[PDB]
Amino acid sequence: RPARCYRYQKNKPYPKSRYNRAVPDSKIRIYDLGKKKATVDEFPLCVHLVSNELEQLSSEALEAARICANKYMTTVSGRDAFHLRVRVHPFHVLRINKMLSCAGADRLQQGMRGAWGKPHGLAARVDIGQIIFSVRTKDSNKDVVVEGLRRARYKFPGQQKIILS
Amino acid sequence: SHGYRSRTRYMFQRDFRKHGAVHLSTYLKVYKVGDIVDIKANGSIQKGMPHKFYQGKTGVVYNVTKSSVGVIINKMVGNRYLEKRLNLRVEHIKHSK
Amino acid sequence: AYSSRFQTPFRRRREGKTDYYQRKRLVTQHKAKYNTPKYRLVVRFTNKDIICQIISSTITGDVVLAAAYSHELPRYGITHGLTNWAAAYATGLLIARRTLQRLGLDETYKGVEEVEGEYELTEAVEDGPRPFKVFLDIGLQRTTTGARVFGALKGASDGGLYVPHSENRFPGWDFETEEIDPELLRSYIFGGHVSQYMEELADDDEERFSELFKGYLADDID
Amino acid sequence: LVFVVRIKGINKIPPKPRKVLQLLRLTRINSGTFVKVTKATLELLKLIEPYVAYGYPSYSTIRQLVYKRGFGKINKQRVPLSDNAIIEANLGKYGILSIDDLIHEIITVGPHFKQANNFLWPFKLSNPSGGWGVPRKFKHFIQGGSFGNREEFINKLVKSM
RNA sequence: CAACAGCUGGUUCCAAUCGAAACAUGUCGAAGCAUGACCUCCGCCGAGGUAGUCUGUGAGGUAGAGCGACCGAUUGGUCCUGUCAAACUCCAAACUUACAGACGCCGUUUGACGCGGGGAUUCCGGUGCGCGGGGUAAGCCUGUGUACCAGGAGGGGAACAACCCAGAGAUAGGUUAAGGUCCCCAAGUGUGGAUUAAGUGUAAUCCUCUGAAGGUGGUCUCGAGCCCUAGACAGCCGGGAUGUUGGCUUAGAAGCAGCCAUCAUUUAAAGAGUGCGUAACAGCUCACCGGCCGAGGUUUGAGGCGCCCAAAAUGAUCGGGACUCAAAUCCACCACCGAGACCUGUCCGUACC
RNA sequence: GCCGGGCAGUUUGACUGGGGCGGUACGCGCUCGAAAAGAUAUCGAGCGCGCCCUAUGGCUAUCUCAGCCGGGGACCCGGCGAAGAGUGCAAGAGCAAAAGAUAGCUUGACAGUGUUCUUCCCAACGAGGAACGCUGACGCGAAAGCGUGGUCUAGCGAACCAAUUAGCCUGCUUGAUGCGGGCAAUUGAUGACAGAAAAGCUACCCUAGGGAUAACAGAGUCGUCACUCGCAAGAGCACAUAUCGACCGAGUGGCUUGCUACCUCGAUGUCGGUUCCCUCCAUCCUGCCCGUGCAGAAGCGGGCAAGGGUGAGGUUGUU
RNA sequence: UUAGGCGGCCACAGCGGUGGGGUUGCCUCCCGUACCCAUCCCGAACACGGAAGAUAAGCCCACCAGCGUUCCGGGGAGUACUGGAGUGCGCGAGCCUCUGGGAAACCCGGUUCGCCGCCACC
């Protein structure tokens, strides 16, 4: 924190586990919520979660913003309705100033060449319109799930659109 | 490291369908005197190969030395001399448009 | 087909006919009556039948000037099994003296011969009988020791055509002997293998085939 | 055919273009040259599309600019290059009436300026108007912009120099 | 002894033609050299040449995309289902590029293309844009393509190396470019229409012009849902039945924590109750009932102008004054101002005939 | 001959987000970076070579595996089985009647001399390397043909001097002997790898220069720091919003810190203190207010507001 | 070629599947090891010799589309992206217009169960 020089893509690939080790584990609980198995897809009421932005939310971003989300999805009696889906994973690894590579801004260090930033965190990135994490059930209430994501958004760097079913 | 097989990656490589040995016909075909021939390296070859830089440009064949034909880009290198060194096999393709 | 992600190699391939990576082998030595896209003194094997062909390739063609295939023998000669070596010495020997010098044999054509002083006349050839040639490719097959494939080569060798090959990678004789060992030159067929199966209990006759060969080297019809 | 006038100057860009402004002729601003629509043409103009105005002038809108700015291999007298100073009344460079007839053959196709009555490009236009579109080159015609085509869009521009 | 230095400083008349390099290889080399690239001069040669485009014949695996195509990542379930790649690829551009023909342009008195030779300077670069790699970032470091500054005037931008117009002989008249037309200041207090009330704004780009995930039934414009002449809103006005506190549960549970039931009566109508509320009652409300004239009403999304989230150090600011049916903003439009550019007279230089 | 800073002359490298320490990106090879031709940087990412092999070379002939199943984790029989079991070593690429395996034979890992490409794109430059010839002599094959080492790209080293290989040239009037000088070539090192024989201290210092390059201050920046706003999970007996308030998102300031290596090295006087002036908020008190989990009293939180006020001492140079 | 050999392009040819064909002309399967030759053990294979018997494999011929592949119509889509231009919009990120190009996924419907060359041959 804060996430600033973290989620703007001004770099290019990898993740690559070959290349990198010492990746921190994600603190993003399972990306399968609600009752799985049965096809939730048969449902009235629909979806949400549209990013409306560019990218790279960190696992710190998604994992408390998503279960936060689920927490107020609990209202629908624990195990009784909806499945929650998350889309993208936090693959993508980021490195931060370890003074040896270059100079100035991050992904630059001291000297020239040298320490790339040391591994510290991972974040998935997204596009202008992608569905961050969706799923629904019949209109349980007015739309508790719609209330969900109200809270879900408001912990994402992006401005997420609710998007109607 | 540095060497003939320098950064090539795709240019040299021939993939899936055309893999293995190639037909003899190409490397057996003869060209005579000034005939414009393109240069390339068909992969799946291990001889009569030119460098890597300069591959893709046409040159004019000239006389043959040993089992290989003087050709290569007789043509100019960059905007420059037709300084030419040619040691290419028929294996690399000939013909003109 | 498939997703077509793969490309399939076939031509002659797919179902087998020719090989490749062989039959390319043959070809380089330009042999045949004349320059050949692919030339051979093919030897094929069939159950109860042996076939000898011979001919330069064409773009579409793979013609054959003269053929053998014991089956036709006996045109003259005799009724016996054709699935043995003897009777696969005869052919490939009968083809020789057909392909081997009749329609034309090794590179002999009207007009000036290929560059090199070379003149061919009847009777023993001047400047060496060496120029007569064909390469014999067993098709898909297995090279063995004295095998009929080779045997096909043996006659259809002393038939005038001169093919490269390796001696000691033949049956010797006996299985297919020469009548007299002191003189290599002779038309010789033997079928010793089967013979002496019994001693001479009855049945098989090696003696008959020497008979055939006698006829072969001589002025015969076709 | 087309008429080309280079509104934008070559401050420095682009280099491949500017090369193909010249070769047309027109090494200046507001100059104008007639181009035949053909391959080995059309490619060049498309390349220099942002630079210049473009289009079919109407004839009798091309006569207007021939008479005012016209020709001569060497700029000199008979400056007006009117009909008289066009097709040879007597011996001389000729073609047709030496007027609209000239910009009749030209509009359809050949002949070219230099080919007949061998006085060559370019037109040297004055560049006036109340103004040209909105000042500064922009996206194109459908926006304030002199860019692109229109028969009677290059008529006005061609007019009033 | 006028030591030597690859280091700092200095090196004195006019004009005309051309016009760089801040890069590559080697170097006890990185504050220096040499050799190439590149600049210039001279001699030779002799007819073609190729900065642009088109077509033809070839080269290519970046963008994108995809992986029931390799590969390696990466969910869940009882085949369905959820995701990815600088060092993945069944695919695959734009585009860059060899060669040729064509058009163009150029060259044969201005001799190109090219060959040989003399003289260099130069090897601290920089900025914009596009593509980048590193870095939290930088008026950062380091590449690449290109145009510019350096070494480029002049017009504009308040000022201002590289942003816009524009590439410049002298002198003169004329018309435009960028930009601008309320004043300062040349030209409009221009036209048709709409938004804005915040002085928002009057700020292209940017170290530079902040503003991200305070308020306004001021006014204008646009959209969506529902309700209306079987009479809506007010829609507005007034009212908010008996068994009974239904049974259970509970400390309580009385329409309204929760579970079960949801009948019946008296009715014009009124649920074993829609929400607020109480400890539970009470109370308010609907839901529900009555009345009332007559035409739209209500809910909500968006935008325009104005009005009254967002903290900094000597005196506030769009260049300033000041401006609001604008001198702001958006959509259209008319007429003007305004360079050395473009046009035009004369002259000068240079090249060529 | 040995000892021998007692004394003399010298050297003690370069790169490098200043220098030093660390490291070498100081010679070389592969993938990516690299923007689909070529070329392309950083103390850029991943990782290798400075050998090994007489076969692990050369040619020719002949040419079924992992694994699973069934029948008697060794082995034997059968079946399934395009390849998950090779090619010395990084990486990428090549290869199936083979370049891989097995067997046999063989020494082309030969001598001599070229052409060309590479090294060094374009575009000059050595050693080195490679491709492709020829001359001579061989090997294997029926033959075409293959073999100029190991499928391809790393595995390398000048001049001088010595040793070594074969023949020849030559040494001052002349012959003989001895011992020399030379033409062609092989081996021996310079890895700071296009090649010097080479350790440090200086605060006793000195010179030449540099803001081409650090310390201090900086105008730009605002990651850091300070403060605010949006959303409001949650907590506060019940109650988000008396009060406390995470995650995430948006900002403002220019007091801290860092960056710029942009400014100054022909010099912008250090820290702390002091004295004397002005300012900032975003208000600590005082005035006037709103809310309260406000009975009162005492508080807590918020609003307007900068008129005035907001100190003395002990340790420590201290801030 | 009422069945062959050598190929070119190298899935439009692949995967899977149905039907038909010969017996003395072909290809095989097949029969059999005296010989040339052969299995680290097996005439399995390789090699040789041969026709008692078959079409059942293979092969050749006709055909099917479920999978894979190729191309095409229509839709997606003139969308995504993009070369050139703009005193067009937006605080900004970014968007828009003009001009010249122009995709992928997927869906529905067709196409594809090879095409071609030489030679030999009832």
From Swiss-Prot, chain A:
GO terms for molecular function: structural constituent of ribosome. It is found in: Cytoplasm. Keywords: Cytoplasm, Isopeptide bond, Phosphoprotein, Repeat, Ribonucleoprotein, Ribosomal protein, Ubl conjugation. One of its GO terms (cellular component) is cytosol. There is a cross-link at K37, K98 (Glycyl lysine isopeptide (Lys-Gly) (interchain with G-Cter in ubiquitin)). The modification Phosphoserine is found at S140. Coiled coil: none annotated. One of its GO terms (biological process) is translational termination. Belongs to the universal ribosomal protein uL16 family. Component of the ribosome, a large ribonucleoprotein complex responsible for the synthesis of proteins in the cell. The small ribosomal subunit (SSU) binds messenger RNAs (mRNAs) and translates the encoded message by selecting cognate aminoacyl-transfer RNA (tRNA) molecules. The large subunit (LSU) contains the ribosomal catalytic site termed the peptidyl transferase center (PTC), which catalyzes the formation of peptide bonds, thereby polymerizing the amino acids delivered by tRNAs into a polypeptide chain. Component of the large ribosomal subunit (LSU). Mature yeast ribosomes consist of a small (40S) and a large (60S) subunit. The 40S small subunit contains 1 molecule of ribosomal RNA (18S rRNA) and 33 different proteins (encoded by 57 genes). The large 60S subunit contains 3 rRNA molecules (25S, 5.8S and 5S rRNA) and 46 different proteins (encoded by 81 genes). This is Large ribosomal subunit protein uL16. It comes from Saccharomyces cerevisiae (strain ATCC 204508 / S288c) (Baker's yeast).
UniProtKB/Swiss-Prot annotation, chain B:
Coiled coil: none annotated. It is found in: Cytoplasm. Its main location: cytoplasm. Keywords: Cytoplasm, Isopeptide bond, Ribonucleoprotein, Ribosomal protein, Ubl conjugation. GO terms for biological process: cytoplasmic translation. There is a cross-link at K29 (Glycyl lysine isopeptide (Lys-Gly) (interchain with G-Cter in ubiquitin)). GO terms for molecular function: structural constituent of ribosome. The keyword Methyltransferase does not apply. GO terms for cellular component: cytosol; cytosolic large ribosomal subunit. Belongs to the eukaryotic ribosomal protein eL21 family. Component of the ribosome, a large ribonucleoprotein complex responsible for the synthesis of proteins in the cell. The small ribosomal subunit (SSU) binds messenger RNAs (mRNAs) and translates the encoded message by selecting cognate aminoacyl-transfer RNA (tRNA) molecules. The large subunit (LSU) contains the ribosomal catalytic site termed the peptidyl transferase center (PTC), which catalyzes the formation of peptide bonds, thereby polymerizing the amino acids delivered by tRNAs into a polypeptide chain. There are 2 genes for eL21 in yeast. Component of the large ribosomal subunit (LSU). Mature yeast ribosomes consist of a small (40S) and a large (60S) subunit. The 40S small subunit contains 1 molecule of ribosomal RNA (18S rRNA) and 33 different proteins (encoded by 57 genes). The large 60S subunit contains 3 rRNA molecules (25S, 5.8S and 5S rRNA) and 46 different proteins (encoded by 81 genes). This is Large ribosomal subunit protein eL21A. The gene is RPL21A.
UniProtKB/Swiss-Prot annotation, chain C:
The keyword Ribonucleoprotein applies. The modification Phosphoserine is found at S157, S166. Keywords: Cytoplasm, Isopeptide bond, Nucleus, Phosphoprotein, Ribonucleoprotein, Ribosomal protein, RNA-binding, rRNA-binding, Ubl conjugation. GO terms for molecular function: 5S rRNA binding; structural constituent of ribosome. The keyword Transferase does not apply. Its main location: cytoplasm. One of its GO terms (cellular component) is cytoplasm. GO terms for biological process: cytoplasmic translation; ribosomal large subunit assembly. Component of the ribosome, a large ribonucleoprotein complex responsible for the synthesis of proteins in the cell. The small ribosomal subunit (SSU) binds messenger RNAs (mRNAs) and translates the encoded message by selecting cognate aminoacyl-transfer RNA (tRNA) molecules. The large subunit (LSU) contains the ribosomal catalytic site termed the peptidyl transferase center (PTC), which catalyzes the formation of peptide bonds, thereby polymerizing the amino acids delivered by tRNAs into a polypeptide chain. Belongs to the universal ribosomal protein uL18 family. This is Large ribosomal subunit protein uL18. It comes from Saccharomyces cerevisiae (strain ATCC 204508 / S288c) (Baker's yeast). The chain holds residues 11 to 232 of 297 of the full protein.
Curated annotation (Swiss-Prot), chain D:
It comes from Saccharomyces cerevisiae (strain ATCC 204508 / S288c). Component of the large ribosomal subunit (LSU). Mature yeast ribosomes consist of a small (40S) and a large (60S) subunit. The 40S small subunit contains 1 molecule of ribosomal RNA (18S rRNA) and 33 different proteins (encoded by 57 genes). The large 60S subunit contains 3 rRNA molecules (25S, 5.8S and 5S rRNA) and 46 different proteins (encoded by 81 genes). Component of the ribosome, a large ribonucleoprotein complex responsible for the synthesis of proteins in the cell. The small ribosomal subunit (SSU) binds messenger RNAs (mRNAs) and translates the encoded message by selecting cognate aminoacyl-transfer RNA (tRNA) molecules. The large subunit (LSU) contains the ribosomal catalytic site termed the peptidyl transferase center (PTC), which catalyzes the formation of peptide bonds, thereby polymerizing the amino acids delivered by tRNAs into a polypeptide chain. GO terms for molecular function: RNA binding; structural constituent of ribosome. Present with 101000 molecules/cell in log phase SD medium. There are 2 genes for uL30 in yeast. It comes from the Eukaryota. Belongs to the universal ribosomal protein uL30 family. The keyword Glycoprotein does not apply. This is Large ribosomal subunit protein uL30A. One of its GO terms (cellular component) is cytoplasm. It is found in: Cytoplasm. Keywords: Cytoplasm, Ribonucleoprotein, Ribosomal protein.
